[PDB]
mmCIF file of C-alpha atoms in Angstrom:
data_model
loop_
_atom_site.group_PDB
_atom_site.id
_atom_site.type_symbol
_atom_site.label_atom_id
_atom_site.label_comp_id
_atom_site.label_asym_id
_atom_site.label_seq_id
_atom_site.Cartn_x
_atom_site.Cartn_y
_atom_site.Cartn_z
ATOM 1 C CA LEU F 24 100.319 118.924 98.829
ATOM 2 C CA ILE F 25 96.562 118.589 98.230
ATOM 3 C CA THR F 26 95.018 117.962 101.677
ATOM 4 C CA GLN F 27 91.285 117.980 100.833
ATOM 5 C CA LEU F 28 89.172 116.025 98.313
ATOM 6 C CA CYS F 29 87.499 119.281 97.202
ATOM 7 C CA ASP F 30 90.884 120.766 96.172
ATOM 8 C CA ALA F 31 91.433 118.872 92.884
ATOM 9 C CA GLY F 32 88.306 116.695 92.882
ATOM 10 C CA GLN F 33 88.161 113.036 93.850
ATOM 11 C CA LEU F 34 91.374 111.003 94.030
ATOM 12 C CA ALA F 35 91.940 107.228 93.738
ATOM 13 C CA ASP F 36 90.786 104.941 96.499
ATOM 14 C CA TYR F 37 92.945 101.967 95.732
ATOM 15 C CA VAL F 38 92.097 100.306 99.056
ATOM 16 C CA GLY F 39 88.430 100.644 98.144
ATOM 17 C CA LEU F 40 89.047 98.860 94.798
ATOM 18 C CA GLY F 41 90.213 95.827 96.828
ATOM 19 C CA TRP F 42 93.875 96.283 95.993
ATOM 20 C CA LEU F 43 95.022 95.813 99.624
ATOM 21 C CA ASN F 44 92.826 92.895 100.734
ATOM 22 C CA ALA F 45 91.012 91.379 97.761
ATOM 23 C CA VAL F 46 93.768 90.568 95.295
ATOM 24 C CA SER F 47 96.143 87.602 95.479
ATOM 25 C CA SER F 48 99.194 88.028 97.729
ATOM 26 C CA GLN F 49 100.304 84.473 96.866
ATOM 27 C CA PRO F 50 103.361 83.532 94.811
ATOM 28 C CA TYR F 51 102.946 83.624 91.026
ATOM 29 C CA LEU F 52 104.844 81.726 88.326
ATOM 30 C CA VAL F 53 107.875 83.379 86.732
ATOM 31 C CA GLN F 54 109.502 81.457 83.884
ATOM 32 C CA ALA F 55 113.125 82.509 83.280
ATOM 33 C CA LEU F 56 113.624 84.769 80.309
ATOM 34 C CA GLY F 57 116.563 83.498 78.265
ATOM 35 C CA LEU F 58 119.930 85.222 77.958
ATOM 36 C CA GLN F 59 119.360 88.454 76.025
ATOM 37 C CA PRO F 60 121.344 90.198 73.266
ATOM 38 C CA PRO F 61 123.486 93.226 74.278
ATOM 39 C CA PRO F 62 121.397 96.206 75.434
ATOM 40 C CA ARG F 63 121.624 99.847 74.457
ATOM 41 C CA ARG F 64 123.610 101.469 77.296
ATOM 42 C CA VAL F 65 122.093 104.550 78.874
ATOM 43 C CA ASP F 66 123.222 108.070 78.078
ATOM 44 C CA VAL F 67 122.438 109.653 81.463
ATOM 45 C CA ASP F 68 122.654 113.160 80.055
ATOM 46 C CA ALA F 69 119.974 112.358 77.450
ATOM 47 C CA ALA F 70 117.847 110.706 80.130
ATOM 48 C CA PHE F 71 117.895 113.826 82.324
ATOM 49 C CA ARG F 72 117.256 116.023 79.268
ATOM 50 C CA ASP F 73 114.218 113.857 78.292
ATOM 51 C CA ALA F 74 113.004 114.109 81.915
ATOM 52 C CA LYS F 75 112.728 117.930 82.150
ATOM 53 C CA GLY F 76 109.228 117.983 80.687
ATOM 54 C CA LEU F 77 107.982 115.099 82.802
ATOM 55 C CA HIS F 78 105.711 115.164 85.827
ATOM 56 C CA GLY F 79 103.675 112.926 88.104
ATOM 57 C CA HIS F 80 100.386 113.380 89.878
ATOM 58 C CA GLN F 81 99.280 113.331 93.512
ATOM 59 C CA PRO F 82 97.595 109.951 93.935
ATOM 60 C CA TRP F 83 95.709 110.527 97.236
ATOM 61 C CA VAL F 84 95.338 113.035 100.049
ATOM 62 C CA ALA F 85 97.452 112.506 103.159
ATOM 63 C CA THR F 86 99.081 114.553 105.893
ATOM 64 C CA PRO F 87 102.229 116.310 104.547
ATOM 65 C CA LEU F 88 105.542 115.752 106.362
ATOM 66 C CA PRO F 89 107.096 119.064 107.487
ATOM 67 C CA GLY F 90 110.337 119.769 105.582
ATOM 68 C CA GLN F 91 109.914 116.813 103.222
ATOM 69 C CA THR F 92 108.513 116.069 99.788
ATOM 70 C CA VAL F 93 107.780 112.574 98.512
ATOM 71 C CA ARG F 94 108.096 111.360 94.946
ATOM 72 C CA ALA F 95 107.390 107.816 93.697
ATOM 73 C CA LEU F 96 107.786 105.703 90.546
ATOM 74 C CA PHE F 97 106.017 102.339 90.157
ATOM 75 C CA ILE F 98 106.718 99.985 87.296
ATOM 76 C CA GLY F 99 104.772 96.747 86.732
ATOM 77 C CA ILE F 100 105.080 94.651 83.638
ATOM 78 C CA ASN F 101 103.020 91.582 82.609
ATOM 79 C CA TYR F 102 104.318 91.271 78.969
ATOM 80 C CA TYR F 103 100.786 90.449 77.797
ATOM 81 C CA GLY F 104 100.417 88.254 74.754
ATOM 82 C CA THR F 105 104.063 87.123 74.636
ATOM 83 C CA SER F 106 106.019 84.064 75.777
ATOM 84 C CA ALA F 107 107.374 86.397 78.506
ATOM 85 C CA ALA F 108 103.850 86.892 79.974
ATOM 86 C CA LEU F 109 103.583 87.015 83.760
ATOM 87 C CA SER F 110 100.351 87.053 85.716
ATOM 88 C CA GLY F 111 101.247 88.940 88.874
ATOM 89 C CA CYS F 112 103.516 91.973 88.265
ATOM 90 C CA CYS F 113 100.843 94.600 87.686
ATOM 91 C CA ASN F 114 99.030 93.113 90.704
ATOM 92 C CA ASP F 115 102.226 93.673 92.741
ATOM 93 C CA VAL F 116 102.001 97.405 91.851
ATOM 94 C CA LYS F 117 98.310 97.351 92.906
ATOM 95 C CA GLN F 118 99.287 96.028 96.318
ATOM 96 C CA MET F 119 102.194 98.464 96.655
ATOM 97 C CA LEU F 120 99.937 101.459 95.890
ATOM 98 C CA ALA F 121 97.149 100.348 98.233
ATOM 99 C CA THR F 122 99.603 99.649 101.065
ATOM 100 C CA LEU F 123 101.205 103.102 100.697
ATOM 101 C CA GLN F 124 97.756 104.672 100.655
ATOM 102 C CA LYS F 125 96.576 102.661 103.682
ATOM 103 C CA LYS F 126 99.652 103.732 105.646
ATOM 104 C CA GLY F 127 99.255 107.359 104.542
ATOM 105 C CA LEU F 128 102.543 108.031 102.751
ATOM 106 C CA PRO F 129 101.982 111.591 101.462
ATOM 107 C CA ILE F 130 103.197 111.248 97.893
ATOM 108 C CA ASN F 131 103.435 114.649 96.140
ATOM 109 C CA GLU F 132 104.002 113.189 92.693
ATOM 110 C CA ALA F 133 103.698 109.619 91.488
ATOM 111 C CA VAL F 134 104.335 108.066 88.090
ATOM 112 C CA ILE F 135 102.830 104.675 87.352
ATOM 113 C CA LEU F 136 104.205 102.719 84.406
ATOM 114 C CA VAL F 137 102.106 99.588 83.869
ATOM 115 C CA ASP F 138 101.041 97.641 80.823
ATOM 116 C CA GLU F 139 97.592 96.753 82.278
ATOM 117 C CA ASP F 140 94.689 98.483 80.581
ATOM 118 C CA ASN F 141 92.067 100.337 82.657
ATOM 119 C CA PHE F 142 94.545 100.806 85.539
ATOM 120 C CA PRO F 143 93.559 103.908 87.505
ATOM 121 C CA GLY F 144 96.379 106.442 87.638
ATOM 122 C CA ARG F 145 98.466 104.833 84.907
ATOM 123 C CA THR F 146 100.899 107.422 83.524
ATOM 124 C CA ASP F 147 102.350 105.576 80.519
ATOM 125 C CA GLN F 148 103.611 102.267 79.189
ATOM 126 C CA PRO F 149 106.729 100.689 80.789
ATOM 127 C CA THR F 150 108.852 100.837 77.612
ATOM 128 C CA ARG F 151 112.676 101.066 77.761
ATOM 129 C CA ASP F 152 112.626 104.776 76.978
ATOM 130 C CA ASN F 153 109.896 105.590 79.515
ATOM 131 C CA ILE F 154 111.598 103.628 82.253
ATOM 132 C CA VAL F 155 114.876 105.415 81.596
ATOM 133 C CA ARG F 156 113.447 108.913 81.431
ATOM 134 C CA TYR F 157 111.134 108.465 84.426
ATOM 135 C CA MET F 158 113.983 107.022 86.505
ATOM 136 C CA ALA F 159 115.764 110.313 85.797
ATOM 137 C CA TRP F 160 112.537 112.188 86.630
ATOM 138 C CA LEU F 161 112.394 110.480 90.044
ATOM 139 C CA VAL F 162 115.785 111.772 91.161
ATOM 140 C CA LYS F 163 116.254 115.004 89.233
ATOM 141 C CA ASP F 164 114.709 117.485 91.682
ATOM 142 C CA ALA F 165 115.980 115.833 94.851
ATOM 143 C CA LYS F 166 116.902 118.199 97.676
ATOM 144 C CA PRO F 167 117.786 117.593 101.354
ATOM 145 C CA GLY F 168 114.870 116.057 103.240
ATOM 146 C CA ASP F 169 113.286 114.561 100.133
ATOM 147 C CA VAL F 170 111.978 111.016 100.129
ATOM 148 C CA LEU F 171 111.921 108.902 96.980
ATOM 149 C CA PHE F 172 110.214 105.551 96.439
ATOM 150 C CA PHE F 173 110.771 103.138 93.559
ATOM 151 C CA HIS F 174 109.084 99.800 92.823
ATOM 152 C CA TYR F 175 109.731 97.470 89.914
ATOM 153 C CA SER F 176 107.943 94.194 89.287
ATOM 154 C CA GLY F 177 108.818 92.410 86.076
ATOM 155 C CA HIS F 178 111.435 90.167 84.521
ATOM 156 C CA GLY F 179 115.038 90.248 85.639
ATOM 157 C CA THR F 180 117.478 88.376 83.430
ATOM 158 C CA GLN F 181 120.990 88.332 82.037
ATOM 159 C CA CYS F 182 122.298 90.006 78.892
ATOM 160 C CA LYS F 183 125.450 89.793 76.798
ATOM 161 C CA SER F 184 128.043 92.575 76.740
ATOM 162 C CA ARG F 185 129.917 94.114 73.816
ATOM 163 C CA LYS F 191 130.906 88.240 80.703
ATOM 164 C CA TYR F 192 127.125 88.671 81.223
ATOM 165 C CA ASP F 193 125.333 91.578 82.897
ATOM 166 C CA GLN F 194 122.253 91.518 85.112
ATOM 167 C CA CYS F 195 119.357 93.508 83.679
ATOM 168 C CA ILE F 196 115.661 94.267 83.760
ATOM 169 C CA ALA F 197 113.336 93.755 80.780
ATOM 170 C CA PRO F 198 111.072 96.615 79.709
ATOM 171 C CA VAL F 199 107.730 95.720 78.069
ATOM 172 C CA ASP F 200 109.338 96.343 74.659
ATOM 173 C CA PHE F 201 112.620 94.536 75.400
ATOM 174 C CA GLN F 202 112.127 92.435 72.248
ATOM 175 C CA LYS F 203 112.619 95.582 70.160
ATOM 176 C CA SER F 204 114.480 97.951 72.473
ATOM 177 C CA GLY F 205 116.617 95.641 74.624
ATOM 178 C CA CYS F 206 117.009 95.481 78.379
ATOM 179 C CA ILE F 207 118.381 97.908 80.971
ATOM 180 C CA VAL F 208 121.532 96.745 82.720
ATOM 181 C CA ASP F 209 121.851 97.054 86.489
ATOM 182 C CA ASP F 210 124.937 99.350 86.211
ATOM 183 C CA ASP F 211 122.751 101.851 84.356
ATOM 184 C CA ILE F 212 119.943 101.595 86.910
ATOM 185 C CA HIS F 213 122.505 102.298 89.673
ATOM 186 C CA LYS F 214 123.750 105.345 87.673
ATOM 187 C CA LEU F 215 120.251 106.711 87.079
ATOM 188 C CA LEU F 216 118.637 105.978 90.431
ATOM 189 C CA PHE F 217 121.431 105.927 93.006
ATOM 190 C CA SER F 218 124.575 107.741 91.811
ATOM 191 C CA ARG F 219 122.970 111.142 91.372
ATOM 192 C CA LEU F 220 121.316 111.447 94.767
ATOM 193 C CA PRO F 221 122.765 114.140 96.974
ATOM 194 C CA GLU F 222 123.389 113.761 100.692
ATOM 195 C CA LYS F 223 120.352 113.809 102.989
ATOM 196 C CA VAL F 224 117.947 112.347 100.416
ATOM 197 C CA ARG F 225 116.350 108.970 101.244
ATOM 198 C CA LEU F 226 115.391 106.460 98.521
ATOM 199 C CA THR F 227 113.781 103.054 98.934
ATOM 200 C CA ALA F 228 113.882 100.774 95.905
ATOM 201 C CA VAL F 229 111.989 97.495 95.707
ATOM 202 C CA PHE F 230 112.979 95.122 92.894
ATOM 203 C CA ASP F 231 110.673 92.142 92.502
ATOM 204 C CA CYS F 232 112.641 89.944 90.092
ATOM 205 C CA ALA F 233 112.438 86.215 90.485
ATOM 206 C CA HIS F 234 115.537 85.514 88.321
ATOM 207 C CA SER F 235 118.121 88.210 88.936
ATOM 208 C CA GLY F 236 120.197 88.243 92.124
ATOM 209 C CA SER F 237 121.358 91.813 91.466
ATOM 210 C CA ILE F 238 121.608 94.238 94.365
ATOM 211 C CA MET F 239 122.159 97.091 91.939
ATOM 212 C CA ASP F 240 125.850 97.432 92.820
ATOM 213 C CA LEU F 241 125.147 98.591 96.453
ATOM 214 C CA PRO F 242 128.047 98.223 98.954
ATOM 215 C CA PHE F 243 126.230 96.706 101.992
ATOM 216 C CA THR F 244 123.749 93.865 102.312
ATOM 217 C CA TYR F 245 121.966 91.657 104.844
ATOM 218 C CA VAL F 246 120.151 88.460 103.931
ATOM 219 C CA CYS F 247 117.537 87.297 106.472
ATOM 220 C CA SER F 248 118.238 83.589 106.113
ATOM 221 C CA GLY F 249 116.692 80.645 108.011
ATOM 222 C CA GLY F 250 119.060 80.604 111.002
ATOM 223 C CA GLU F 251 118.509 84.183 112.055
ATOM 224 C CA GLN F 252 116.549 84.674 115.262
ATOM 225 C CA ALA F 253 114.720 87.544 116.959
ATOM 226 C CA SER F 254 117.114 87.099 119.922
ATOM 227 C CA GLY F 255 120.176 87.544 117.708
ATOM 228 C CA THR F 256 121.824 90.807 116.692
ATOM 229 C CA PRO F 257 122.110 91.028 112.911
ATOM 230 C CA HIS F 258 124.469 93.393 111.048
ATOM 231 C CA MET F 259 124.883 94.355 107.416
ATOM 232 C CA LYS F 260 128.145 93.344 105.703
ATOM 233 C CA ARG F 261 130.244 95.050 103.064
ATOM 234 C CA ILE F 262 130.247 93.200 99.741
ATOM 235 C CA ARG F 263 131.916 95.786 97.497
ATOM 236 C CA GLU F 264 134.905 97.999 97.891
ATOM 237 C CA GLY F 265 134.306 101.657 97.112
ATOM 238 C CA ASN F 266 131.018 103.513 96.940
ATOM 239 C CA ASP F 267 129.622 106.193 94.634
ATOM 240 C CA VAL F 268 126.299 106.830 96.396
ATOM 241 C CA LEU F 269 125.953 109.939 98.602
ATOM 242 C CA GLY F 270 122.292 109.550 99.444
ATOM 243 C CA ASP F 271 120.668 107.018 101.722
ATOM 244 C CA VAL F 272 119.512 104.222 99.445
ATOM 245 C CA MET F 273 117.785 101.139 100.766
ATOM 246 C CA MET F 274 116.819 98.270 98.499
ATOM 247 C CA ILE F 275 114.527 95.330 99.217
ATOM 248 C CA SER F 276 114.717 92.245 97.045
ATOM 249 C CA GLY F 277 114.356 88.474 97.391
ATOM 250 C CA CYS F 278 117.171 85.966 97.239
ATOM 251 C CA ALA F 279 117.960 82.304 97.899
ATOM 252 C CA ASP F 280 118.186 81.325 101.584
ATOM 253 C CA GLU F 281 121.900 81.304 102.483
ATOM 254 C CA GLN F 282 121.400 78.797 105.284
ATOM 255 C CA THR F 283 122.402 75.357 104.035
ATOM 256 C CA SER F 284 119.416 73.020 104.028
ATOM 257 C CA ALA F 285 119.432 69.815 106.035
ATOM 258 C CA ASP F 286 117.888 68.063 102.977
ATOM 259 C CA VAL F 287 120.219 65.282 101.753
ATOM 260 C CA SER F 297 105.957 73.578 96.369
ATOM 261 C CA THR F 298 106.962 77.233 95.991
ATOM 262 C CA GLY F 299 106.432 80.247 93.741
ATOM 263 C CA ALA F 300 109.142 82.517 92.410
ATOM 264 C CA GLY F 301 107.228 85.743 91.701
ATOM 265 C CA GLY F 302 106.113 88.379 94.192
ATOM 266 C CA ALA F 303 108.430 87.921 97.176
ATOM 267 C CA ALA F 304 110.013 91.389 97.293
ATOM 268 C CA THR F 305 106.587 93.046 97.037
ATOM 269 C CA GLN F 306 105.192 90.898 99.864
ATOM 270 C CA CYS F 307 108.297 91.751 101.864
ATOM 271 C CA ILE F 308 107.941 95.544 101.664
ATOM 272 C CA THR F 309 104.117 95.484 101.987
ATOM 273 C CA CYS F 310 104.374 93.185 105.081
ATOM 274 C CA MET F 311 107.000 95.514 106.554
ATOM 275 C CA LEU F 312 104.711 98.504 106.020
ATOM 276 C CA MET F 313 101.524 96.723 107.240
ATOM 277 C CA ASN F 314 103.132 95.870 110.565
ATOM 278 C CA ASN F 315 101.727 98.582 112.773
ATOM 279 C CA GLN F 316 104.188 98.346 115.674
ATOM 280 C CA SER F 317 107.227 100.539 114.714
ATOM 281 C CA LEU F 318 109.642 97.601 114.704
ATOM 282 C CA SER F 319 113.391 97.757 113.909
ATOM 283 C CA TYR F 320 114.720 96.726 110.485
ATOM 284 C CA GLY F 321 116.125 93.549 112.083
ATOM 285 C CA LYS F 322 112.986 92.373 113.882
ATOM 286 C CA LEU F 323 110.793 93.237 110.967
ATOM 287 C CA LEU F 324 112.895 91.245 108.498
ATOM 288 C CA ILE F 325 112.499 88.128 110.732
ATOM 289 C CA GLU F 326 108.741 88.569 110.668
ATOM 290 C CA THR F 327 108.734 88.971 106.866
ATOM 291 C CA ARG F 328 111.044 86.000 106.417
ATOM 292 C CA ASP F 329 108.548 83.883 108.361
ATOM 293 C CA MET F 330 105.658 85.249 106.273
ATOM 294 C CA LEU F 331 107.444 84.429 102.975
ATOM 295 C CA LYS F 332 108.099 80.859 104.084
ATOM 296 C CA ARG F 333 104.486 80.448 105.309
ATOM 297 C CA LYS F 334 103.172 81.661 101.939
ATOM 298 C CA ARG F 335 105.430 79.266 100.030
ATOM 299 C CA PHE F 336 107.710 81.835 98.408
ATOM 300 C CA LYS F 337 111.094 80.524 97.290
ATOM 301 C CA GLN F 338 113.009 83.634 98.376
ATOM 302 C CA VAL F 339 114.052 85.136 101.739
ATOM 303 C CA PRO F 340 114.350 88.908 102.318
ATOM 304 C CA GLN F 341 117.493 90.774 101.246
ATOM 305 C CA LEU F 342 118.088 94.332 102.387
ATOM 306 C CA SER F 343 120.865 96.236 100.639
ATOM 307 C CA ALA F 344 121.998 99.795 101.203
ATOM 308 C CA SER F 345 124.431 102.597 100.420
ATOM 309 C CA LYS F 346 125.537 102.694 104.097
ATOM 310 C CA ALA F 347 125.771 100.030 106.808
ATOM 311 C CA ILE F 348 122.374 100.536 108.423
ATOM 312 C CA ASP F 349 122.172 99.854 112.165
ATOM 313 C CA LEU F 350 119.467 97.192 112.092
ATOM 314 C CA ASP F 351 118.281 98.236 115.560
ATOM 315 C CA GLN F 352 116.948 101.418 113.932
ATOM 316 C CA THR F 353 113.192 101.560 113.429
ATOM 317 C CA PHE F 354 112.115 100.743 109.866
ATOM 318 C CA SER F 355 110.748 103.678 107.871
ATOM 319 C CA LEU F 356 110.546 104.916 104.316
ATOM 320 C CA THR F 357 111.237 108.506 105.270
ATOM 321 C CA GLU F 358 114.256 108.709 107.595
ATOM 322 C CA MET F 359 117.994 108.880 106.977
ATOM 323 C CA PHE F 360 119.986 105.871 108.181
ATOM 324 C CA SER F 361 121.669 105.474 111.514
ATOM 325 C CA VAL F 362 125.074 104.118 110.589
ATOM 326 C CA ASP F 363 126.501 100.942 112.093
ATOM 327 C CA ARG F 364 130.010 102.115 112.888
ATOM 328 C CA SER F 365 131.178 98.523 113.449
ATOM 329 C CA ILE F 366 131.063 97.868 109.676
ATOM 330 C CA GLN F 367 133.951 99.367 107.643
#
């Protein structure tokens, strides 16, 4: 890792560009994309082949973690100039980058796929083919102790099969089709070895996908700081060896007593809030705090944490550590 600003010249100061404190952290509008035609399913072999030439860059200087390397992929898509246009997804990536910089995550290599022009550090356009190959890039070199970070802000929708699948929409989905959640799970999760940690944040207002992960916890309205939350199993079987954690937003599962909000940006506010809390709180306590923040800011969604193992929610939240397993969950 580069540990001095004289080593490779000046690096980005995303905090200094106002990306932590001077951009909107409010909900933004996300109109549902219609049902899409069948996608082109991913050939994982081709993806990993097309990834061998690829590389990221070190986005800032930070203190390196002994025995660990950090890699990150950020995808933000505004679909400029189309009926799919969204105002806040590239801004979500801005906030994610500035928060990681502020908290000093020592990223060795980052790839930034955004469709915003003049975006410092942008690697390439978030097309179907770039998303696929850079997803493979993120996981391809992973060795014990490694830490991977993934963030997507853009449309989530449904697509037909050759009944419907959940999917994400690349910037060129009109020409190239979407990427189904099964394929994302295969690219990002299924090829991790043991002892590698990944955190994946999906900010999709209109897909409830948890990327096929076996355990989940929704921090709904009736949860309290003086309760003891646990994850639950929602799928039989598991093909993930690594420690994958996913943050997304979903509908509150508490039934309302009823007898304005915004849909875009919740998952990004959730993870950035979690990181900006400076107190080394547990997953469980921290999710309560973020739930309260989301409600206060008029987001529609509550936090949803999903994982490849039943995480003991008394464990301290981090992006870098392997999970302590809740043995009470089969």
